[PDB]
Amino acid sequence: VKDFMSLSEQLRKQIRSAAKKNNLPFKLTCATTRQVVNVVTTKIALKGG
Amino acid sequence: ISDEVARDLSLQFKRPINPTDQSSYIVDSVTVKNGSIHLYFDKAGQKTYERHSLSHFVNLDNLRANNTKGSLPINVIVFDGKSKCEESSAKSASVYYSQLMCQPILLLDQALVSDVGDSAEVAVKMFDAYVNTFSSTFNVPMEKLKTLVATAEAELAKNVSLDNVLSTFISAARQGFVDSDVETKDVVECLKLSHQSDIEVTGDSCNNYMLTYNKVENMTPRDLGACIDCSARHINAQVAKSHNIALIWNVKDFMSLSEQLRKQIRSAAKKNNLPFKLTCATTRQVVNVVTTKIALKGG
Amino acid sequence: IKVFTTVDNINLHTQVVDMSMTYGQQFGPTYLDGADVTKIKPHNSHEGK
Amino acid sequence: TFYVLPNDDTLRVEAFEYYHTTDPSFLGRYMSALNHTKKWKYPQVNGLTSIKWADNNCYLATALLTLQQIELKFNPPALQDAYYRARAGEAANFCALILA
């Protein structure tokens, strides 16, 4: 919830629209725990330099 | 002019007047850059922010409302948010200082300010805490530790990463006091996890015991498989208290567990007020106990 | 040889000793099941004790 | 039944970094096998997983039984978590990974 609040409104709307278009279920939580599971993922960060 | 004074002035002058601004506002987020601190708040539905020097934030007691100095260098007041008593009085007390400074006063929760206190030597403080924990674990004579810390001071002056410096420090120190099977990375990770989670660490043998309150019905399959691998057992709390038995688990296996499971286990232990420590040992102690082996209802 | 050592008798601790010298010459006063081993050199069967 | 996935070299490089396998066609075969293996059922006997006979799964079940009783660790964290889940009953994904 707090991270979602830190986001911009347009970004939230775009993310939700994309999720709904791709038929992807999505939920929110107040917990501070992380789902450490096996997934091929790329960290969202700046490029190297 | 604020509402708390506007009404009095209107009563004195026998005609209505219009206040110009509110007395105080509440800060919601903090950003620190280039030795300065930024405070953010919402005013009339719009985001607002200000910038101030971080130097004045070292002494939190100087910014308290009950300061006997009688003057505020900055328009920021630090108060405990969880303390419902003083947070209500702070709103009323802010009026006098706002009139003195002729501008609104910013309300800031104490916990955030406590988190604000930060420097580049905090890593050095953490390193010193790790060294103290290691010394308490092994009771090495002070002079060798002081020489190694003197070397680590030059290493910090080189501004190298904490991981490599601590690894070299422990590898140099581990000679003559640590068994060969132990690895430096294990000690470093255990110290980091101990500092971050506020957990005490000992080198004694583990037992892999748990209480009945950690019900298996809520277990995820992955954590249940991990428990099967570690071969944990259940025991009554009072029976363990009678024999003065603490909760001892291997640091690597405990780290392999999920965050939620570890938090639940720690919460249950603290509720039952049970000592708990992690260890790097790979052996199990043998004590006269009555325990039930945790297993699935396989069939 | 590799042998086990402990204080609370349930913990995990292990020591490695050489068979050239006796237990006492390397460590000191040591006993095993009521038998003094301070002035006795080990043999193969003492492994794992 | 067939499945189609586009090509992305960056994703395959990340998959190799995670799983230590250089096969560029690993992902598609793995998914195709996993989809078929999800159809199966895996009961347990005496706390040990049992499988109804299908598609010559006898040696796979024997390997599962062998793994259930031996000390075992893996370098890929994903494979280790898959083994953890398999020992808890989610053997389909682990078997699919082994076959892939």
From Swiss-Prot, chain A:
Secretion signal, residue range per the UniProt entry: none
Membrane topology according to the record: Multi-pass membrane protein
UniProt-annotated location(s): Host endoplasmic reticulum membrane
Regulation: Inhibited in vitro by GRL-0617.
Catalytic activity: Thiol-dependent hydrolysis of ester, thioester, amide, peptide and isopeptide bonds formed by the C-terminal Gly of ubiquitin (a 76-residue protein attached to proteins as an intracellular targeting signal)
Physiological role: Responsible for the cleavages located at the N-terminus of the replicase polyprotein. Participates together with nsp4 in the assembly of virally-induced cytoplasmic double-membrane vesicles necessary for viral replication. Antagonizes innate immune induction of type I interferon by blocking the phosphorylation, dimerization and subsequent nuclear translocation of host IRF3. Also prevents host NF-kappa-B signaling. In addition, PL-PRO possesses a deubiquitinating/deISGylating activity and processes both 'Lys-48'- and 'Lys-63'-linked polyubiquitin chains from cellular substrates.
Assembly notes: May form homohexamers. Interacts with N protein.
Protein name: Papain-like protease nsp3
Gene expressing this chain: rep
Curated annotation (Swiss-Prot), chain C:
Superkingdom, taxonomy of origin: Viruses
Activity regulation summary: Inhibited in vitro by GRL-0617.
Ubiquitin-like domain ranges (all copies): 1-49
Entry membrane topology: Multi-pass membrane protein
Catalytic activity: Thiol-dependent hydrolysis of ester, thioester, amide, peptide and isopeptide bonds formed by the C-terminal Gly of ubiquitin (a 76-residue protein attached to proteins as an intracellular targeting signal)
Subcellular localization(s) per the UniProt record: Host endoplasmic reticulum membrane
Function: Responsible for the cleavages located at the N-terminus of the replicase polyprotein. Participates together with nsp4 in the assembly of virally-induced cytoplasmic double-membrane vesicles necessary for viral replication. Antagonizes innate immune induction of type I interferon by blocking the phosphorylation, dimerization and subsequent nuclear translocation of host IRF3. Also prevents host NF-kappa-B signaling. In addition, PL-PRO possesses a deubiquitinating/deISGylating activity and processes both 'Lys-48'- and 'Lys-63'-linked polyubiquitin chains from cellular substrates.
Oligomer and partners: May form homohexamers. Interacts with N protein.
Name the UniProt record assigns to this protein: Papain-like protease nsp3
Organism (species): Severe acute respiratory syndrome coronavirus 2
Gene: rep
Residues of the full protein shown: 1568 to 1616 of 7096
